[PDB]
Design a protein around this ligand. Structure first.
Ligand SMILES: CCCCCCCCCCCCCCCCCCCC(=O)O[C@H](COC(=O)CCCCCCCCCCCCCC)COP(=O)(O)OCCN
Ligand SMILES: CCCCCCCCCCCCCCCCCCCC(=O)O[C@H](COC(=O)CCCCCCCCCCCCCC)COP(=O)(O)OCCN
Ligand SMILES: CCCCCCCCCCCCCCCCCCCC(=O)O[C@H](COC(=O)CCCCCCCCCCCCCC)COP(=O)(O)OCCN
Ligand SMILES: CCCCCCCCCCCCCCCCCCCC(=O)O[C@H](COC(=O)CCCCCCCCCCCCCC)COP(=O)(O)OCCN
Ligand SMILES: CCCCCCCCCCCCCCCCCCCC(=O)O[C@H](COC(=O)CCCCCCCCCCCCCC)COP(=O)(O)OCCN
Ligand SMILES: CCCCCCCCCCCCCCCCCCCC(=O)O[C@H](COC(=O)CCCCCCCCCCCCCC)COP(=O)(O)OCCN
Ligand SMILES: CCCCCCCCCCCCCCCCCCCC(=O)O[C@H](COC(=O)CCCCCCCCCCCCCC)COP(=O)(O)OCCN
Lengths: 50, 149, 50, 95
């Protein structure tokens, strides 16, 4: 693997550029927040009996 | 940030040492370096990833935080290892000019001072290690005490 | 018209105001991808232009 | 990682006519410098968190203290203790 790429710098550069582009695209579509979602769901039932 | 440069540092240091101590053209000095240290990279990467693998296997708020930390750490480390294997050799063989004979030597100012200090530190460290190995019993009790503390 | 009178779109009009066109944006990506692939295959930055 | 960097090289080197002590000493001598480089790069990188301040600095300081001191002390102790571990383990669990 290491001997294959020692003779082909341009192919390695191409792979690196593809990785960079993928990273930028991923950054462009990531929501921001303070902390991850850690709260569990809850359901409340309301009743009235005057 | 400080962990993704370990493999590249290892590779570059090995190739630089070979070039400086053997006077070798970069293209095959790189191949020799890759042959020598092709297993250390994989060992280091496996060791690093095996500890962050279990963090992503818990539930709750703590589990969520652990997953968020561990997945990012592991993905970055894996990409760093792949890049060190793939791209580092190419640049080190093509974009790195030949080292002039003794170019690293004859440094003056801060660099020469630092080189002397580091040589002295290495000599002292080797002298201490060679000694700590003739007492394999007392040092074990010292280690046990350290662990207990 | 004074305040108290607004405007809304319907049917086909909704998406036009919701955005324009982005066909040119994607056409450029398909060229960069082809250039990168051809550069990797040829092992040279200059030939893929032909 | 720091321990394996020496253990693997010593294991490879002893397999060819090298005693345990000789292999351990040679491995330590050859692997010293990269270990220091890789450890202190991390230490200097994490220093910014150690002295954090401003908005949301409590968590930064909390993580920085532990990581910084653990790395420093662990590296300083390991660089001197790992060869002993290799020698003792090889001597007791023969083969
Ligand atoms: C919970 C259970 C599961 C837990 C899972 C935990 C997460 C696991 C994450 C795994 C991450 C692995 C990342 C590795 C990236 C690099 C892989 C390289 C493998 C390798 O070194 O072998 C090379 C293969 O080349 C070839 O044979 C030619 C093909 C080249 C591409 C092969 C790699 C695939 C794409 C990357 C040749 O070896 P070498 O020349 O590099 O050096 C000698 C190394 N001893
Ligand atoms: C991370 C994403 C990585 C995507 C790019 C990975 C590139 C790996 C290149 C390996 C090429 C290689 O050495 O062998 C090739 C076969 O590929 C294979 O057999 C494995 C291909 C996996 C992709 C063709 O072989 P060769 O003609 O290059 O010379 C070797 C004589 N077998
Ligand atoms: C997006 C598409 C537009 C930007 C990406 C296109 C990438 C095309 C790069 C062509 C560079 C040609 C010039 C060149 O030959 O640079 C060679 C390497 O530099 C390089 O390989 C430069 C690598 C660039 C990496 C940063 C670009 C990523 C941007 C991706 C955004 C998505 C050095 O060769 P030399 O000319 O000095 O001659 C001596 C050779 N021995
Ligand atoms: C070499 C490659 C450089 C990589 C830089 C990637 C920048 C990505 C720009 C794309 C982008 O939309 O960034 C917007 C500007 O944010 C910013 O303010 C960018 C701040 C980072 C600049 C300093 C970079 C560190 C060096 C925020 O993203 P968005 O608002 O569009 O949507 C994100 C919802 N998750
Ligand atoms: C709790 C459990 C956690 C498990 C975590 C495991 C993490 C391990 C991540 C790295 C493991 C190494 C994976 C690939 C390296 C294995 C040995 C590679 C040696 C090599 O270069 O062989 C070449 C072909 O191998 C190849 O082509 C490799 C193809 C794959 C020739
Ligand atoms: C000559 C050589 C002879 C070889 C020796 C002979 C063969 C002996 C083989 C013995 C095999 C070990 C038997 C251990 C029983 C398994 C213990 C429970 C495992 C379990 O519940 O799942 C784990 C729970 O961790 C979680 O994430 C959930 C939280 C609970 C974790 C607390 C459990 C304590 C774990 C301490 C270590 C236990 C062993 C773990 C390997 C996650 O693991 P998994 O279910 O996903 O399985 C990995 C599949 N890829
Ligand atoms: C909508 C249209 C979008 C189409 C996009 C297609 C791809 C655009 C990028 C093409 C980059 C061409 C670079 C190029 O071929 O010129 C090289 C040097 O450039 C030079 O003249 C000097 C080097 C500086 C050029 C850097 C190019 C970066 C431009 C990227 C943004 C545009 C020639 O070098 P060579 O091919 O002879 O090297 C041989 C190594 N084996």
């Amino acid at each position: 693997m290491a001997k294959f790429f020692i003779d082909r710098p341009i192919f390695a550069w191409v792979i690196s550029i593809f990785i960079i582009a993928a990273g930028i695209f991923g950054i462009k579509s990531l929501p921001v927040s303070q902390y991850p979602s850690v709260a569990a769901p809850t359901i409340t039932l309301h009743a009235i009996y005057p | 940030i400080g962990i993704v440069v370990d493999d590249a540092i290892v590779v570059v240091e090995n190739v630089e040492r070979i070039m400086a101590g053997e006077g070798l053209p970069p293209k095959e000095a790189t191949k020799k370096a890759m042959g020598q240290i092709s297993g250390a990279v994989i060992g280091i990467t496996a060791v690093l990833i095996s500890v962050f693998v279990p963090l992503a296997m818990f539930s709750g708020a703590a589990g969520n935080i652990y997953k968020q930390f561990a997945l990012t750490m592991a993905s970055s480390i894996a990409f760093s290892a792949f890049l060190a294997l793939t791209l580092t050799p190419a640049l080190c063989a093509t974009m790195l000019k030949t080292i002039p004979k003794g170019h690293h030597e004859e440094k003056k100012g801060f660099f020469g001072w630092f080189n002397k200090k580091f040589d002295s530190w290495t000599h002292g460290y080797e002298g201490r290690v060679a000694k700590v190995l003739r007492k394999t019993f007392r040092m074990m009790v010292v280690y046990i005490g350290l662990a207990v503390v | 018209l004074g305040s108290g009178y607004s405007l809304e779109w319907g049917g086909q009009s909704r998406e036009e105001a919701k955005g324009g066109s982005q066909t040119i944006a994607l056409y450029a990506l398909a060229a960069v991808a082809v250039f990168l692939v051809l550069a990797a295959l040829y092992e040279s930055w200059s030939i893929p232009l032909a | 990682k720091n321990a394996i960097l020496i253990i693997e090289f010593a294991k490879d080197l002893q397999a060819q006519g090298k005693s345990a002590v000789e292999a351990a000493l040679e491995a330590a001598r050859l692997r010293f410098r990269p270990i220091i480089m890789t450890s202190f790069a991390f230490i200097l990188g994490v220093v910014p968190l150690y002295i954090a301040g401003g908005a949301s600095s409590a968590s930064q300081r909390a993580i920085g203290t532990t990581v910084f001191w653990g790395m420093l002390i662990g590296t300083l102790l390991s660089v001197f203790l790992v060869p002993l571990f290799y020698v003792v383990v090889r001597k007791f669990f023969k083969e």
